[PDB]
Amino acid sequence: DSHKIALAQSETEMRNLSHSLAEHATHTFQGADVVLDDIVSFMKWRPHPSPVFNERLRALADNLPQLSDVAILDADGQLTYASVKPVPALDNSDRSYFRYHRANDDHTLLITGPIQSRTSGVWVFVVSRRLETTDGKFFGVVVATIESEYFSTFYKTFDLGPGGSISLLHSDGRLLIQWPSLQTGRDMANMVLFQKALPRSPDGYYLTVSPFDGLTKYLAYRRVSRYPLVVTVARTEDSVLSG
């Protein structure tokens, strides 16, 4: 079959494409990790900068295309600095990421979402790091909002036919972004991807039904190296229809 050779190369392109998408995720989060880390350090020996720092944060944010904004919370969960202004110095100690860093001494970029951003009102995912004093006791929290448009914009650069689709998901089924629908936040754990494929392995290729448009397509997926994320690429196969 001609149709067989062509399906095999298509599977090959999909499997590579998933590999590229996974790295892009890795590199993008890494980028962000590095920046939050500059901040862990500043805070460490500057543990009370002046209102100038808000400008520094605003500069920093406008320079990371993947982070919409950045903020600091002190050791009581109170927002002390931000790239936004005015600066909403509210109490956010209820927030899970805050609770998590206060309880655990570790350096993981934490990914949390979806939540309704206390700086912009938009439903977003967010990334965060524990602040520490030179003694390394808890000192609060840098959090930054993941700019989801950064991913969808990259995702649309790919020629996938009508029906083409890319998603970025959390290892646990939470959807961070999906192209072209633009959905985000929803819980996709019932997908086959999470019920059977990921438990069996960490990619990667099979036939399935899109939950976004109901179409049948081949899907390739791959765990994102170094963060609990998964990427998926899908395309309708092609036929006829109708009747």
**Nearest Cα residue to 165 out of 127, 220, 85, 205:** 220
Task: For residues 160 and 158, give the distance between their C-alpha atoms in angstroms, rounded to a whole number.
Answer: 6
Q: Which two tokens stand for residue 226?
A: 């170094």
Detail the DSSP E strand segments found in the chain. Answer: 67-73, 79-82, 110-116, 123-132, 138-146, 165-170, 175-179, 203-209, 216-223, 229-236
Contact criterion met (CB below 8 Å) for 202 and 223: yes
How far apart are the C-alpha atoms of 152 and 166, rounded to whole Å?
8
- The closest of 65, 59, 80 to 24, measured between CA atoms, is 65
Token pair recorded at residue 192: 């086959």
156 CA to centre of own chain: 17
- Burial (CB < 10 A; 0-12, 13-18, 19+), residue 9, is exposed
Positions of CATH 3.30.450.20 in the chain: 1-147, 148-237
Rg value, the chain, Cα: 20
Q: Beta 165-170 vs 175-179: how paired, if at all?
A: antiparallel
Give the 3-state secondary structure of residue 204.
strand
Tell me: cis bond preceding 86? Omega within 30 of 0 counts.
yes
Is residue 144 a contact partner of residue 36, using CB atoms and an 8 Å limit?
Answer: yes
Any idea what the Cα angle at residue 60 is, between residues 54 and 65, rounded to 5°? 135
Tokens of 134: 């030179």
- 82 vs 80: CA distance, rounded Å: 7
Residue 42 CB neighbours (<10 A): 16
Half-sphere exposure of 76 (CA within 13 A, CB side): 5
Tokens at 223, concatenated: 């765990």
Single-letter code of the amino acid located at 172: D
CATH fourth-level superfamily of 1-147: PAS domain (3.30.450.20)
Q: Which tokens in the block code for residue 184?
A: 């985000």
- What letter represents residue 206's amino acid? Y
For the domain spanning 148-237, the CATH number is 3.30.450.20
Quote the strand ranges of 19-100, DSSP E.
Answer: 67-73, 79-82
Q: Is 59 helix (H, G, I), strand (E, B) or coil?
A: helix
